[PDB]
Symmetry: C2
Subunit: 252 residues, 2 copies
């Protein structure tokens, strides 16, 4: 692999945007989605998809569920269908892809085993992905969080990958409370210490996944999602972002 120019003044070559289930559903209303939230988020993701044509995936959270874990693949398929239907309704070539048919685990590491994802991107379409039940090398099913799906893109994406995880907080909170603006993935021990101090394991899962991505060059963010908020700044160099934006940025 050759030298990849990187930095806060560079434009991303690929966007993996993950939308947390908490932003468009409620745990105490299982299976129901907030259609107004989905609709408004979809308009903002559609704009991103126009610019990042063939250079973006949308990952949906939500769709929570010996072999009973198989029902998870069906649950998270439904959530991908809901986003893809909405996005096609507004002119985006959105196509849901079952991660379980494309990816398996080996030694705990997700392995992309289907060429289809790269082809769909090359055709200019928008894959809609989600967490899933994945088989390992012994045939055992494991729940693979939506928050870890960006990891599967690492060997396949060329150039500068930006990963954005939209959640119900502005980033990782630390001791009053304040957001930790930057985390160095090479040695992120202080971010993990902040989580212990400000909790009560979904944020820990996010941190582990985004550290993994950042160690492989990605520019990663945990930030607050809001259905109606404009996301066009996610196409731009980090140094050009509006002043109001708050996030935890994870890089190496």
């Amino acid at each position: 692999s050759g030298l990849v120019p990187r930095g806060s003044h560079m434009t991303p070559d690929f966007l993996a945007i993950k939308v947390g289930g908490s932003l468009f559903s409620r745990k105490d209303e299982p299976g129901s989605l907030d259609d107004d939230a989905v609709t408004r988020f979809a308009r903002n993701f559609a704009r991103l998809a126009e610019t990042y044509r063939g250079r973006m995936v949308l990952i949906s959270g939500g769709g929570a569920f010996a072999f009973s874990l198989a029902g998870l693949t069906e649950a998270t398929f439904e959530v991908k269908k809901r986003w893809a239907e909405k996005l096609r309704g507004i002119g985006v070539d959105a196509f849901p892809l079952q991660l379980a048919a494309m990816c398996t685990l080996r030694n705990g590491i997700p392995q992309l085993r289907s060429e289809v994802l790269r082809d769909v991107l090359d055709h200019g379409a928008l894959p809609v992905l989600a967490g899933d039940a994945l088989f390992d090398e012994h045939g055992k099913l494991w729940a693979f969080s939506s928050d870890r799906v960006p990891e599967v893109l690492l060997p396949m994406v060329e150039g500068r990958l930006r990963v954005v995880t939209l959640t119900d907080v502005d980033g990782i909170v630390t001791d009053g409370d304040t957001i930790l603006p930057e985390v160095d993935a090479r040695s992120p021990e202080q971010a993990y210490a902040a989580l212990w101090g400000s909790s009560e394991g979904a944020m820990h899962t996010k941190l582990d996944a985004l550290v993994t991505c950042a160690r492989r060059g990605a520019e990663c963010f945990i930030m607050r999602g809001d259905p109606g908020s404009d996301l066009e700044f996610l196409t731009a160099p980090f140094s050009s972002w509006p002043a109001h934006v708050r996030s935890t940025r994870i890089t190496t």
Copy 2:
């Protein structure tokens, strides 16, 4: 490829069983499935899956639907989910797999592009498949009938593949009317002549797919499905089948 012993006295090494949508749904009641039919068929397929552990796929018909064809992948996912849920309910390790995430078209020929299907079989599970919208090499979506799904298995299955398409007739009818018992895939022109004479293109699609499979060694059947009917004879050599069974058998 070495010499494969074949003939009506040999046991199949693999079963691809396709259940027609007409057998468990109604065109005039779109999206609804007949749960009693699904339940009774599932009990019979579960028995087959016990014997053909890792050596069978179930293909569901039904789930009918620029990029609007994408909705087909969602529709046929639902039908796979319905069968897989039912089969897991009776102890079968049934896992639905989106063919569109595993297979694309090149020069009109389906190409298996994901290793997951073979792995799932090797783990001893039952893949549940269906027709789908598949991308071609130019990024165009095509409707790929459930009736053609056995074609995708041809390069992957070793040994003797038996393909059984369950439909609402006993086979191909010819001129009174009688069932054509045998078709030679090397030169099946009389079967196509029978279809022209006894019609008014789903049976033609079946015939084309099963001729394609038979020319690659498969032993193929068009026969009548019935939810409650015992299917154990499908594990046995054709020469051992009960006398009451009627079918059109397609081989080369």
